[PDB]
């Protein structure tokens, strides 16, 4: 037994993998290693075709779900076909269909080559063709994860037991209880010795708890400001304004990037539980290894602005051809740390004479303003596909992606070369050129489409006897701790 307080309450793999909770009870076909390569949990073999439009998957013969029913090609095919089912929350634009070849073999058909399809194999949990959404009386959820539901009490707790049919490696906890608490009850329960693990906010200045220690775990979770890259004038299909005449100037974006002191933001806002990020894929293999800069450099930021024609006007604000550098940074309301960061960003930019006003609202309000204004966002992903979402001209203005309508046809070309690669390892050099290819890019040396700021580290208090192990950096989502669950002792 172990009791954890890692966040509130779903577990349905068809809702996708933006959150980690599905991993308690379900399993994808592959699992990512700490070094970013893939291990097969459920497959003996997988192979893309040379044209890249076909993948063949071979299941191990001895697979069952958590109720003891068999996990077969049919289940994998159903899972993929159904996740692609039209009003689905999973992104399966490039996927066409999954065919059963025999009970141990599935062929996937894609519209075009996609090096990142390996990430879908390693993320989409496999559900039962027979049992998924059957709504049968008395039937618990059925998956192939390491645990199995025993009981669920909304607003209170969940109890699970080790899944005896699990294809992977068992940990040392036969039973887990996940309690759904508020921070104060969490700490009281932690001090009482009731809880063995508690997620705490990274921005908390945590002290000592009795018989507990602090684990700081790396994450892909990040923060950044995305800039409108074109000038004002146009509108989108809902009448929302696109462009900003100030941030359309690359000198502004570069200057802001150089002026911000990331480390200082880490130490002052996030209690040192963050690291500077200069790109949206900091720490990952597909990060360009020369994309970092020496920041918190007001002098250099100033030179940058002067050489591009931004001169201090009489009001102490930078100006170019009668346009003063007055911008509004929009961010989502309801989180005091996000406000703190927004304010810090204003205060760091005053000294170079860019006047940043602050505005928050609901998502719905932010949606209307995000194409006309620099906007603070939190992203982060273990999938390089994310670079395409940020920087492809085809992602421009699709939902929350590429809100700044950034378009650079060389970056499009490198994204496409990365998608065309035959392994993710062979894609890496092309993903890296997205930032900078010797001549152009999306990154600071090139178009500075963003001011990336930080990667957050996730923080947990754990009883002294608990080892949370290792894994990939945690996702940006709730229950992100579970990526390491097969290695708890």
Automatic annotation (TrEMBL):
Family: Belongs to the bacterial solute-binding protein 5 family.
Keywords: Signal, Transport
Name of a matching Pfam family: SBP_bac_5
Transmembrane segments: none
GO cellular component term of the entry, any: outer membrane-bounded periplasmic space
InterPro entries in the record: Peptide/Ni-bd (IPR030678), SBP_5 (IPR039424), SBP_5_dom (IPR000914)
SUPFAM superfamilies: Periplasmic binding protein-like II (SSF53850)
GO biological process, one term: peptide transport
GO MF annotation, one: peptide transmembrane transporter activity
Protein name in UniProt: Solute-binding protein
């Amino acid at each position: 037994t172990l009791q954890l307080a890692i966040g509130d309450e779903g577990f349905d793999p068809m809702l996708g993998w933006s959150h980690g909770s599905y991993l308690l009870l379900h399993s994808p076909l592959l699992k990512q290693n700490e070094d970013f390569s893939w291990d097969s949990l459920l497959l003996s073999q997988y192979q893309p075709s040379d044209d890249g439009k076909t993948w063949l998957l071979t299941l191990k013969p001895d697979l069952k779900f958590s109720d003891g029913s068999p996990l077969t090609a049919k289940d994998v095919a159903f899972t993929y076909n159904n996740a692609a089912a039209s009003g689905g929350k999973v992104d399966m634009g490039n996927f066409l269909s999954a065919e059963v070849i025999d009970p141990l073999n599935v062929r996937i058909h894609l519209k075009a080559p996609q090096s990142t399809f390996v990430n879908v194999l390693g993320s989409l949990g496999i559900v039962s063709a027979d049992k998924y959404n059957a709504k049968t009386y008395a039937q618990k959820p059925i998956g192939a994860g390491p645990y199995r539901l025993v009981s669920f009490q909304p607003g209170q707790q969940m109890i699970v037991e080790a899944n005896p049919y699990y294809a992977g490696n068992k940990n040392d906890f036969d039973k887990l209880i996940f309690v759904f608490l508020d921070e104060d009850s969490a700490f009281a329960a932690a001090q009482s010795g009731q809880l063995g693990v508690v997620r705490i906010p990274p921005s908390m200045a945590v002290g000592s708890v009795n018989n507990m220690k602090l684990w700081v775990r790396p994450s892909v979770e990040n923060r950044g400001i995305v800039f409108p890259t074109t000038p004002a004038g146009k509108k989108d299909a809902h009448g929302y304004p696109i462009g900003n005449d100030v941030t359309a100037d690359v000198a502004i974006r570069r200057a802001i990037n150089y002026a911000i002191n990331r480390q200082l933001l880490a130490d002052q806002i996030m209690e040192g539980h963050a690291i500077p990020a200069y790109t949206g894929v900091q720490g990952l293999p597909w990060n360009n290894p020369d994309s970092a800069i020496k920041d918190g450099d007001i002098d250099k930021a100033k030179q940058i602005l002067e050489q591009a024609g931004w001169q201090l006007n009489s009001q102490g604000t930078r100006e170019k051809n009668g346009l003063p550098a007055k911008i509004t940074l929009w961010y989502t309301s309801g989180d005091t740390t996000r406000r703190d960061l927004a304010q810090a960003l204003r205060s760091m930019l005053k000294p170079i004479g860019i006047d940043v006003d602050l505005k928050s609202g609901s998502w719905e309000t932010v949606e209307r303003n995000m194409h006309a204004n620099p906007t603070l966002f939190g992203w982060g992903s273990l999938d390089p596909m994310e670079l395409y979402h940020h920087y492809s001209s085809n992602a421009a203005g699709v939902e929350y992606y590429n809100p700044g309508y950034y378009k650079n046809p060389m970056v499009d070309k490198h994204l496409q070369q990365a998608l065309d690669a035959p392994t993710w390892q062979q894609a890496v050099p092309f993903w890296q050129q997205v930032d900078w290819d010797g001549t152009t890019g999306a990154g600071i040396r090139g178009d500075a489409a963003w001011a990336w700021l930080l990667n957050i580290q996730h923080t947990y208090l754990a009883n002294n006897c608990v080892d949370l192990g290792k894994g990939t950096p945690e996702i940006h989502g709730s229950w992100s701790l579970l990526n390491s669950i097969d290695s708890w002792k």
